[PDB]
């Protein structure tokens with residue numbers, strides 16, 4: 001209950017996720033456990049998908065590295081046990097999306113973080129609000145964090161920043177943590193997995209264009 | 222109480238402006254009252270400068286045609302009243318800023334307007350544009366930056382404030398058409414005079430007329446930490 | 447395109463509300479229709495219960511001057527159809543709650559309205575109750591988790607100040623809107639939203655924060671103060 | 675080379691235009707005594723705002739000082755075996771300048787515990803009370819024609835943050851009871867304190883907790899009525 005077991009709850013949550021329609025093998029389950037306990041590699045692969053990079057290698061703390069290439073046709077390609085493994089770009093983005101929904105860190109309010117400038121839809125941002133719901137008909141997504149630029153705060157001249165788990169690169173100042181915060185983390189994480197909510201960073205191609213029309217349709221009068 | 226006469230206050234305000242240290246000829250003032258009562262030309266030359274357009278021409282309702290050419294040397298070329306006048310781009314942008322500070326409209330709260338999608342980063346923001354309801358007015362930038370102001374603070378119609386949509390900083394040069402005018406009574410008229418009375422007494426301009434020297438200075442002001 | 451007759455849906459919606467433990471006679475229906483078609487009396491009745499007043503009558507040229515008086519015990523007393531009817535305080539609070547959910551008005555974003563300064567606090571400094579001009583920046587705000595029985599009708603700023611961020615916002619309910627002054631933008635989308643929004647509150651059996659019972663009002667204070 | 679509030683305090687009083695008080699040394703040493711003791715500077719504020727009879731600052735022999743107050747608006751104290759009586763409005767502006775010099779500046783994200791019994795007697799009004807509050811915005815100018823007043827802090831309820839259902843609360847330093855958490859503090863945050871304190875004292879501003887009764891009713895009518 002209080003102790004979090006993201007490893008044991010990972011395989012069942014992946015199967016309970018309704019949008020999952022790809023092959024789920026033991027290696028697929030093992031790949032999420034490796035990337036789950038190492039978000040620095042999980043976020044580096046998201047940049048491979050979001051920024052359409054050519055490849056990305058994750059060097060361990062020892063020195064050995066693991067290569068993950070991206071095909072220009074829209075597909076993630078790598079080799080497990082020295083054997084080729086294919087992953088569609090729309091299916092692999094959902095894979096790393098559920099990992100962040102399970103192995104993602106819930107930072108408290110007031111946590112001063114440093115967003116990755118390369119993933120800012122193209123310095124220091126304090127987290128003022130977390131896990132805000134999206135609009136109706138888009139309950140499958142959520143804004144992980146959101147806040148103002150530190151230390152200016154709620155000055156309307158400074159526009160707010162929508163921060164996902166993939167945008168946070170470095171944590172500078174941790175927020176307040178106590179028994180209420182841990183209770184707030186538990187009751188908020190369960191709803192993020194119960195309603196099958198993904199981060200807005202893992203928005204698919206069709207959901208991106210459809211959400212733009214949702215904004216323009218009322219004014220399309 | 223006091224009826225606002227932008228044509229009467231324009232000559233004294235333009236001369237009392239501290240940053241104004243350039244030509245204040247009679248034709249210059251005659252051009253300000255011409256662009257003030259004709260907002261379609263005040264915003265058109267603004268698009269000529271900001272969007273780096275080649276030229277721009279405007280005809281009045283009676284046929285008064287004036288052509289504004291933008292030289293590659295950064296000079297505003299135009300011929301007005303049988304006389305050709307050159308205007309440095311870093312100085313002509315300040316000239317049209319005082320015009321908007323005197324002749325600019327002051328829409329009430331809740332005014333659903335349409336924005337000029339051409340000026341405001343089109344693909345960053347789809348063809349007709351989503352409507353913006355002016356929910357705020359006259360917003361200061363920061364300390365040591367009181368020389369510029371945010372004209373309007375807008376939410377996206379009809380989603381509102383509670384909706385998790387990024388807000389929009391709107392300016393008079395940015396507002397294209399007015400789709401729905403807000404409530405305007407005696408409290409609103411005195412609020413217009415209170416806001417405009419402070420924007421001209423403190424010698425403030427809009428962020429649309431922010432010089433590139435000050436635009437980068439405002440970026441490093443918040444990047445210093 | 448489908449028009450809305452709140453009188454037709456009124457009795458079956460009263461059956462949809464499960465918390466009903468009071469006697470729902472036909473006189474209860476006609477009284478709600480009387481309070482529904484005439485929101486001028488429905489709101490004054492709410493002030494009789496919330497502010498613990500002596501009485502309140504709705505003088506009308508049609509002669510339907512129904513006087514509503516409540517005792518110290520919280521017993522709403524009136525006479526309808528030439529017959530004396532007695533109601534309780536907490537039961538009459540939930541009675542007008544369904545009326546407001548069925549006969550409630552939906553104003554678009556940017557609708558500048560007037561508010562009643564009497565319900566809020568002791569505004570004797572004003573001594574008028576040219577006051578409380580508030581523009582509606584948001585509508586139908588869900589209250590909170592485990593509190594879906596109630597909801598915030600409107601969320602807006604003080605007019606003509608706007609989102610000044612130096613004056614705190616106002617959570618406006620339909621029982622607080624004093625008088626409508628300006629109307630927002632209305633198109634096919636707005637009327638489409640009005641048609642689907644008023645049916646969702648009746649679907650989820652939601653009330654307004656004005657009808658917040660003390661037990662649930664304290665329960666909301668525990669959620670804001672006591673951890674979990 | 676750091677802040678010397680004890681040294682600047684007598685210079686600020688000379689600079690302060692609103693001061694209509696005697697420039698005696700007893701007032702100087704008493705303000706410095708209250709400046710280095712927040713429990714005493716904030717305790718007498720509860721004696722005046724909540725309109726209490728007496729209040730004693732129990733401490734060492736001599737350090738212990740009692741503050742009595744009658745109903746006709748007169749404060750009473752004795753400092754160094756010397757009895758001095760201040761008027762209620764004369765003693766409010768006195769502690770207001772002390773909180774402007776010896777006031778504490780907290781960084782962003784500082785979760786503070788508030789004095790709830792003093793909160794109820796404030797601008798609660800429609801906003802309600804709304805325990806733990808995080809400081810999101812600091813030093814907000816009150817308004818025009820009220821520039822001499824400032825809002826020390828304002829934020830949301832912890833750990834909810836900016837939520838549409840969560841009403842924001844404006845927090846003065848006199849309202850801060852206990853400090854639970856602390857925000858990030860680099861050298862820019864220290865520079866911000868030099869920028870903020872160099873502005874509040876130069877513009878001669880006071881916290882909204884020190885709003886005089888003449889300006890309290892005047893600010894309320896400005897929001898409600900088109901009086902100006």
Ligand SMILES: [Cl-]
Pocket residue numbers: 614797798801842843844845
């Ligand atoms: Cl408050």
